[PDB]
Design a protein around this ligand. Structure first.
Ligand code: HEM
Ligand SMILES: CNCc1ccccc1
Length: 292
């Protein structure tokens, strides 16, 4: 097992990171046209997850710590097609705040996006440190979407996530959409795809899903409302253990928010050793809470 010890960017404290948060949040508000007016929130959430989801608990390779998405091997992972948009969004932020590590920036982008989209508070810790190009994980550690519940369950064991954590994390698929050219899947999951809600679960349960083929010749579940579910999304109502948890989150928005927050923080922190005298996690104020 590799050890990656969090090291606070020199002399920085909460206020410095709140300024970075605010710059991301202001740019989210400004650059509103992206992806037919969805805006950049969803893609920044996906970026934070994909830079974290390379982690392997068995040897501590991958994970958010090293900021390795900046290197070509990872940037060009077919699993990451489309995330270049999130990276380009963050470039002016990094230029303004060149002191933040890449992993801190990519993970903070996700936190900022969730919160600005009216999601739960996500505590966040600084101290990821850029690591060299040879530490970039090989392609193929992110999950396939054409598979079943057993695949999902097994996949997420590598990330140390249990059934509840998996079902909670998947609720992020209320955000944004699938794009045929990126992933071979097309369409949104619901009507509210740049506001963070529990609509993924409601739509799973309440829509009439039909197994269809899309224009890339892949199967996906479609509804007459114009929404879709990936096979891995739909697996959460095929498996009886997942189904129970889907029903719980469909019926309790606060529970969903609390469980998502904990699972997302955990995802973003996997692989990182925090010294006992490290700062406590930061909880950033939204622009709205600041009157900004
Ligand atoms: C079994 C696990 C998962 C699979 C197979 C999967 C698959 C996908 C696919 C195929 C897309 C569409 C990409 C595109 O065409 O642009 C997507 C989008 C997205 N995923 Fe996942 N995903 C998984 C888990 C997660 C998790 C755990 C999160 C975060 C907590 C997440 C967040 C997102 C977001 C926010 C988008 C929308 C991106 C956009 O609109 O640009 N996904 N996912
Ligand atoms: C909710 N199912 C469609 C979808 C999957 C991934 C991201 C957004 C939407």
């Amino acid at each position: 097992t590799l050890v990656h010890v969090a090291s606070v960017e020199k002399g920085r404290s909460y206020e410095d990171f709140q300024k970075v948060y605010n710059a991301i949040a202001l740019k989210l508000r400004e650059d509103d046209e992206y992806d037919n007016y969805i805006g950049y929130g969803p893609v920044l959430v996906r970026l934070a997850w994909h830079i974290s989801g390379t982690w392997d608990k068995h040897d501590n390779t991958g994970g958010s710590y090293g900021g390795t998405y900046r290197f070509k091997k990872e940037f060009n992972d077919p699993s990451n097609a489309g995330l270049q948009n999130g990276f380009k969004f963050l470039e002016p932020i990094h230029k303004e705040f060149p002191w933040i590590s890449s992993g801190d920036l990519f993970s903070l982008g996700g936190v900022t996006a969730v919160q600005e989209m009216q999601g739960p508070k996500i505590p966040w810790r600084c101290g990821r440190v850029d690591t060299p190009e040879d530490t970039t994980p090989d392609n193929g550690r992110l999950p396939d979407a054409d598979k079943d519940a057993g695949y999902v369950r097994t996949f997420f064991q590598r990330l140390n996530m249990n059934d509840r954590e998996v079902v909670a994390l998947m609720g992020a698929h209320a955000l944004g959409k699938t794009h045929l050219k990126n992933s071979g899947y097309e369409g949104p999951g619901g009507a509210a795809n740049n506001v963070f809600t529990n609509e993924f679960y409601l739509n799973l349960l309440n829509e009439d899903w039909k197994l269809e083929k899309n224009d890339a010749n892949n199967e996906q579940w479609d509804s007459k409302s114009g929404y879709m579910m990936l096979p891995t999304d739909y697996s959460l109502i095929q498996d009886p253990k997942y189904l129970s948890i889907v029903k719980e989150y469909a019926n309790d928005q606060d529970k969903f928010f609390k469980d998502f927050s904990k699972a997302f923080e955990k995802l973003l922190e996997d692989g990182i050793t925090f010294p006992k005298d490290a700062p406590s996690p930061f909880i950033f104020k939204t622009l709205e809470e600041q009157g900004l």
